[model samples]
Every structure is written in structure tokens, then in C-alpha cells.
Target: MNLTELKNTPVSELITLGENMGLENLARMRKQDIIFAILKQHAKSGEDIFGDGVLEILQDGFGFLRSADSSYLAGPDDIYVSPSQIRRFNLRTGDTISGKIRPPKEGERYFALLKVNEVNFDKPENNKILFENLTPLHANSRLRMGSTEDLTARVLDLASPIGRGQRGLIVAPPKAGKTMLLQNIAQSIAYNHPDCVLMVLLIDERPEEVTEMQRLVKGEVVASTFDEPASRHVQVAEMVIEKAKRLVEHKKDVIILLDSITRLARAYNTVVPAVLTGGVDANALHRPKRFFGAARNVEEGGSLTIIATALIDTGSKMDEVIYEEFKGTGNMELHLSRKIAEKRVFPAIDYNRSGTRKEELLTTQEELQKMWILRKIIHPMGEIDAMEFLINKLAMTKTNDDFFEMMK
Candidate 1:
């Protein structure tokens, strides 16, 4: 088709037209790129180049280029590749690779890929276009919070319960078990709620932490180490959040475990200062809202729960820009105390400082009453002694008859 006709055509139609015109590079190009190429070809009267397919990499290192219809029948026209070709192209599953195909030899079932041209990292089939309406998260949604075997659910339920679409922050100092607490929550969701889709994004974390998390958390992981560029870290996170958005659109419950958004903020701090306008620190407070804003509930019937970690230093209270951002956005902040961590308390949540917004709407009246009583009793004690005092107070102060009398 001519440029005029192509300009008016839809992307889906352009894809078909490019296939018919024997355009090998069409799959790798977006609509505008494809149009420009077709216009250039029309001017030069160039020979057509066709032979591209989606790479279906298998576990054993050998794989085939699936046909447009996604078949692997091994016909004479089909393309197959050896291990060397895969290595040369740095091929991975779900990649669309374009190249020249050599004709099959005698008795061979497929052709060989030669002269690789381009590789498209995105899988077009997995792309979801429309994600328009998202409702803000609130306690009235009454979504269940899944728990771990260590009674994480019970702890959260009584202390700082989170709903399905809520955005939660796990803030702690270095070595204060922030990652471990997140891992426990993730493990619980993976094991208990088999139906929920779990997605983990590890940005700028240590390699050992990534490995340990991979071992315990069952989910789709998108990771980048500290050595990678800040832009790469942001790109990986946005990509994963986009995918999770699509999953939520499909009416699937998705829980995203972001190991530490503090690093993501640092990434923004690194990249934004370089590109931002004068006197503007793009990483300061607003950048985090953009990331956390993606966590929401769709009125259509699904939720995207985001539980992220934030790193704080000892003696540096929750006054960090990132902490303020989350608090301003009304996210549940589960602060971990260094003293509590030093004491080796599992999940080390500071009940007095940490709280959930509108939690009374999520819990029953009785549960809310119990939470109120607990809060009143625990608020006065300092960080190191609060848990011990609360436990002892509950155990010793009230008998069954006294408890009944108080209730009455």
C-alpha cells in the first residue's frame, strides 16, 4: 500500500500488510517505523526481505522460531536454530527475531536462521492496551489480607490490617529485617492464596538478597542490580507495573512485592537531577507518588496490592522524603524499630508508630474495639519495651470474668 493508505491504516492492519509485502523487520518496528520503511522501499524499489518469527526458547538451549500462527510443525519452510545462533543473538523466550532463512537441506524438516537483523524484546501477544478506570484504595473495599504461617495475617489484622488494593510501606533501618518481613508476606500469599498473581520487582538490591528471595518467593521477578544504570532500574519497574496493570484488568488479583522503593527513589534521584529543569529535584517527593499510584483497585472486579520496603538509618526517624510521600498518600506504614530488630523480633513492627488508614472500615466493630483498646494500652510505652509490656499486660491484668465484666 502507498504511504497515504498506510497513514490511515490501523496497526493491526499494518502488521498484516507488512507480512504480505515480505517485510522481515516489520514485527520489530512500531507502526510509524513500519510506515517509514515501507515508504522508503517504495521509493527505492528494493527487494523484499522476509523471514522472521517469535523465538520459542526451550530449556535445553535449542528452540524454534514459531510461525505467524505460533506453530512448530517443522515444515520445510519453518526456521530452526542451533545453540550457537541462540548465543549469538542473546535470544530469550518471548523475543521476536528477524533474519534471513536458508532453505532446508535434503530430508531436513526446517530452514536455518542466517543473517539476523533485529530483535524485539516485547511480546506483542502479551500486550494489553486499555487500562483506563482505576478506583482509589480504601478500607471500605473489605478485601482480605492473606497471612503467613507465623501468624503474619493475625498480627497485621490486629495491629495494622491492609486491604487488597492498599499500598503498604515496610520501613526499617539497614539490617533490620525489612527484606525478611517482605519475603514472609510474599511466601504466605504464594502458599495460601494460590489464585493470586504474585509479582516481585527487585531494583538495585544485592545479588545474594535476590537469590535468597528467589528461593523463598514464588512469583515473576524483574530484577536489576546496583551496578546497572538508574534509567534501567526505572524502566524495569515501570514495565513490571504495566504488566501488573494488565493482569488486574483481566480480573485477576495481583500482589506486587517491591523489595525497596528507596532504591527506586535513589534511581530517580540519580537520573532526574541530570535531566530535570533547574532548581527542581524530581526525586524528592513526587517521583514516589508516580510509582505508588499504580497500586489501585479497578471497579471492574480486580485489585493490585503493592507492599514496598523503605530503608531508614538508625536514629533517623520517619522523616525521610520517601516516608513523607507514602504517609501523604495515605499508605499503611509498618515501621520496623532497630531496637526491635536487635532483639530479634520476627516482623519487628512498631505498633505505636505504625498504623493503617481507615482500618476501622475493614474490621468488624468488635475487632475495631479490640484494636482501639490495644492501641490505647500500647501507645505510651517506648519502642524497645512496648511489645514486652503489652504481652505481659494482656496475660496478667484481666481474668475471663473481668474481661466479660468489662465487655458488659
Candidate 2:
């Protein structure tokens, strides 16, 4: 039996096994020592050193294949899998893995993966397209956000058609229902796309909102409230994106609802300037750019959709800093209106200000023209007939056929 099988063996049995193996000092040897000693016996007899564990990926791109058969906390039995090893396997978090482990090198804490043969009980199928080599592009498939009656979703469907792997930025002023709009979108995606993986990152949020988002979104929420240090905010946001990227490598569609990259932007300014440089290095624009730029539609088999919230430019230095950092960062900009929000407009989306880049790919020329004309309801030359007839026709048409029926 290997270390994995031996770890499942109880301490009582290990001590008895050690005693039978003619080891000295049973009482002095701790349970860990006893296990190692037992494994040493197997090693002496030419048994292979192998382990079976659940992989828990940590920050900094490394991971620990934690023991599945044992309960020893931070035990020596947990094996290490370096970033290179993880990349070769395209390993995702919580993947049950089986591999050979080499003994720790000088000053190392745990065994490292000598060779990984199986990932989740099958032979490791290495993903062929490395992230750098894959040709990335804006996705053309429409992201169905909600049912037919949801006008907010319909507005997006007709105009700025966001899709898989699109970077959608919800730009809103204070009190313009940013959180509520995000909550609605998240809930719809959860309801609509049951197969897709949804990860929510809430940094610098209130405690109560975090709790509600957890309850409402019904998926993984990596949260760090405003009470925590700025460093903590950076850590959580980075981890959420990293985890999502790894999942995408596994051919899964991942949607990360990062509520406020504005907060992440602020946190980076708060934390990074001190460590890297000094004296008002405001809006350096490298790190946050890297963060927002990870959204992509990999031409292979996967996608990563990042829908992050950002604050509208209020002309404040920091708000402008947020703008300058994330300007032109995403494909779809969903701007929220404070005026309409205060007047109790549901969703309160500023349709005139909002836009989706490369929109021609999403719809036909004629269809695009029709939606553009309807946007403002202006006569605009040959676009309209009886003025009140246009209003009546708009009310009646909920689908293409409904709209076309009037056209005839």
C-alpha cells in the first residue's frame, strides 16, 4: 500500500504496524512520525510512493493536493503541485487527482507531484490550446438574459447584444441602482444558463449586501467587505478571476460578476503604489488593465464572461482615475441613469449613453436600422407613418413577427 492507503490507516493501526516493523520509540514518535516511519518501511521494500487527493488551488498559481483519506490538518501528507504541473493537466479546483509524489526537497513542507497519471479518474487530457496561442475574439452568439417580458433584457437583446466571454461594464452613478441591476442580471443568468459556472466577486461591499448576494445569486461568491484591509480586496478579486480562468481552460463557460472593479481599482491604487513606487503615481493603469483584459472567447472550447460594475465619471479625481483606467475596456457598456433611478424607473438604463462595440456582427443591417429608428421614435425621414400609429405598433410588437405584422 502507498502513502494514500496508509494515510487511511488509523493511528492506532499505524503504531501497531510500526511496532511490528521493529521500529524504536513508539511513544516518542508522533502520529505523523509513525506514518512516515511506516512509509519508510514500504520504501525500503520497493513500494511506490503515490497519493490520491483533492486539489485545492492556492494563490500564486501553485496548489496542494490535500489528502482525501486523512484528517490531519496541514499535515505533511498533503502533496504539492506546482504551477507547471497544474498547467500540464489543465487542473481545476476540487479535481480529484491521483499521482506519484517525490519526497520533499531541502526546506520544503510537503511532497511534490513526481508524476500525475490521472485527473478525476481518467488519463489526463492536456488541453491543446495554450492561453497565449489561442486566437481570442468577441463572441457572436446571443446571451439570453431573461424571458420575453423582461424589457431591460430585451433592450440589451435588440441593441447591445452581450454574449459569452463578453466584457460587460455596468457604469452607474451613486444611487442609480447599480447593485440592484447587477443582482437582477445575475439572477437572470443563473435562471437562464443553468449549465454555465457563475462566480461572484464582491470586494469592498457591505456585510448585509454580501449576505444577500450570496443568498440571491445561488453560486460561488468570493467576498471581502470594506471593513477589511485594501490588500484583502486585491487578493479576493485576483483569486476570483484566476479561478474563473482555470475553469474556462476546462471547456466550461464561466461568468464572473465582479460587483465593482471601481473598488478593485481603488484598492490597487491604495496598496500597489506604496510597494512599487511613491509620490502620487495616480492612475498607473497597468494592473487593472490586466484584470479587465482577461475576458475572452477562446476559439477552442471555452469562454470567460466578465460582467464587472464600474462607477460613472463624476469629475472627481478618483472617479476620473477610474474612468481613465478602464476607458474602452469592455465590449458592452450598460450605463445607469441617476435621474431616472430617482424617479423610480425600473432598471433606469441610460439607453443613449450605453453601447455595444462591433454591433454589426450581432444583427442584420435591416434589423439594426429598425431598432435604431425605434430607439428615439423620431420621424427621421422614411422611418415612420401616422405618429400615434407608431406608438400603437410599438406596444403591440413583442417579437419579430409582431413587429413584421405591422410592417406589412
Candidate 3:
């Protein structure tokens, strides 16, 4: 379409066109921004943002469609397809493709695939669904994270059930299997809820952890090793969260797995100088708030669930400010135990220390009551032995007297 035609198109249609072109963030742009972007593209290329090229499929299922110019390096810096889009088109490596290129958003380095006009020699219709402006549902919508078959999921559902829009913390010390538990949760969701999109962001973790997660878990992963700057982490996270918000606009459930919010905070510290005179004050809560606040249930029946990890010291103390700020927010804390980890429990969750505010929404009162009783039964015991006793008490099929005796 010419610049005039593009400009004259209804704003809604233009927004849809932008989405089809892989500019999901267009929904948030102003009308003038959209118009200017189109005009700039035409001005730069002296033609519509369209290209005909040979495809080079990437390992991740997306492909780069290269134009006739041989000098252009075909990588992430060029026209790209959606996940599985190239496969759906049945295009092979070196197959020719004709498609419109969507203008990159400000600060983005590469153009994006808009619509596939032709694949090999076949011309397909251009009708594609774009981002629709769906009104999010009330904040009260609950996200169920369990299946009847997964025992770990059942434990999470009963002990620390997560709500749809809640910000969650998975707190643990070193070597406490926090990442393993997070991976299990991600795998469970991938297996049971194919509709929900998972995005795993690994910041400052072991490189091997990234490889293992990529192998076993299903999700879009954005990661940086220990050497990368904190700014890169924040940038990648912003991009992922923006994409998740776009999915939310489409009324899809999204769960974002942040391996460590502590790293993200540390990143902020590295990038931004302390505003307070005493170096960084203990009350530096704004960064955490901004990051975690993105987790919420929209009125459009969509939700963004954040499950982030926090590393504590041997003293079991987290960043005091972060703890206070996150505690006050609508977050459910799941404190994992080093003692339980030493015993080789899979989840190693500290039952008494970990609880969810979403129980009323996600579980029946009877179940919630039972969970509370279990917590009480184990609360007085050492962290190591409490979980074992709690498990026995929960599994006891005998009379109340027998259960009480066992608890005693």
C-alpha cells in the first residue's frame, strides 16, 4: 500500500496491519507515531516496505527471508517470521518468499515480517489476525496452575497456589533447588496448558542452567550470562514483558519466569547511580515495583503471572527494602528451604513460610482450611523435619485421633 493509502486506512485497521507485520507494540503507539513511521519507511526506501527473498530457517523455527542483495547478513537483524510461521507455510531453506516488512519500533535494530505474500511459487491470501483491543477482565481473575496428574502441581495448588495476575517470589538460599522447582512448574504448564505462553528470562545464572532449561522446558527464552551488563537484562525483560502485554491484549494467558529478581535489582543499581547521598539506600524499591507491577490480570480475561526468584544469604535475609516492598505488593511468597534441599526433596518448599493470598479464589474453603491446619501442625518443628511430618499428616487416612497422634 502507498503512504497515502496507509495513512487513510482506519486507525484500527492500521493497528491490525501493524500487528500482522509483527509490531505488536503498535497498539501502544499514538496515531501520529504510526503515520510518521509509515511515511519514514516510504521516504527511506522510496517504495512500500515489501521484499521478495530466499528463506534461511533458524534452529528456533523462525526464518529470515533474505532480499536479492547478497551483502545483507541474514540474521536477527532482518525480516523474521513468527514462531512456527515458516513451518506452517511449508517453506524450506532457500525457498523464495515475498512479504511486507514492518517498520521497526524506535530503538529496534531490525525489520519484522508483516504478511507472507508468497511462498515458493504459491500466492496465499493475506488475511491474518492482528492484535485486537480486548478489554482486560477485573483484577480478581484467578490463574489455576495445576493438573490432577502432577503431584508437584497439586502441592503448589494446595500450599502456594498462584493467582492469575499475582507477583510471586520463590525465595531460597544457594543450592536450594529454586531453579529446579521453577523449571518443573514451567514444564507442568507447558504440558497441561498449551494455550498459555511461557517466557523464561535468565539473568546472571550459570550458562549450563540456560542450556538445561532450553533442553527440558518449553518457552521463549531471553538470557544473559554473568558477564553481561545489567542494562541488557532490563532491556530484554522490557521487550519480553511488552510481548506478553500484547499477548494479554489478545486475551492469552502468559507466565513469565524470571530466574532472579535480585539480579534485576542489582542491574538497576549498576546502571543508575544512587539518587540518595548514602550510596544506594535500603529503600530503593522503585525498580522492583516497576518490574513486578507488570504482573496483573487485565479486564480482557488475560493474565500475566510473574514467578521470580530471590537469593538470600546464609543468614536467610533478603534485600530488606525489596522484601518490604514486595511483601506489601500483591505478591505470594514461596520461601524454599536449604534444610529441605539438603534432604533432597524435589520442591523443598518451606510450608509455613510459603503461602498464597489466592487460596480463596483458587481453592475451596475446606481445602484452604486443611492447608492451614497442616501449616499449623508443622509450624513448630524444625524446617527440615516439618515438611516430612506435614506430608505424613496430610497423607494420613486414619481417624482424627490417629492423625493427631502422628502429628504429635
Clashes within 3 Å, all models in order: 0, 0, 11
For model 2, where is the 10-residue window of minimal lDDT?
379-388
Q: Return the number of clashes found in candidate 1.
A: 0
By the TM-score metric, which is better: model 1 or model 2?
Answer: 2
Local accuracy of candidate 2 as per-residue lDDT tens digits, 1-408: 467777667878877778888887776867777777766566564466787776778878998775422211245678788899888877866566786776665687577788888874567874433246264565566576624335556555654577778888888888877877777777778787878888888888898998888778767766887898887777666656655665666677888888888878778777875422222245445677677887877777778888888876555567656765576878888877776667655556666567788776666777667667666553342212322333344456664544577656
Judging by lDDT, tell me the better candidate of 1 and 2.
Answer: 2
- In model 1, the runs with Cα more than 4 Å from the true position are 1-131, 134-136, 141-153, 273-280, 283-285, 314-319, 389-408
TM match of model 1 to true structure: 0.62
Q: Provide the RMSD of all predictions against the true structure, rounded to 1 decimal.
A: 14.6, 8.3, 14.2
The TM-score ranking, best first, is 2, 3, 1
lDDT-based ranking, best first? Answer: 2, 1, 3
Give the higher-TM-score candidate: 1 or 3. 3
lDDT by residue (tens digit), candidate 1, 1-408: 333345568988887876776778587777867765554454334433346655666568886665432112233344576789888756654455666555444676455675566665233223222247647555665543321244444454456677777787887887676776777677667776778788788888787877777778777665777787887777667556655665565567778888777778767666665433333354454665677886776676778878888776634332355555566464677888878778865546677878888787677886577668767876887886776654443344332222344445
Residue 386 CA displacement from its true place in model 1, Å: 1.9
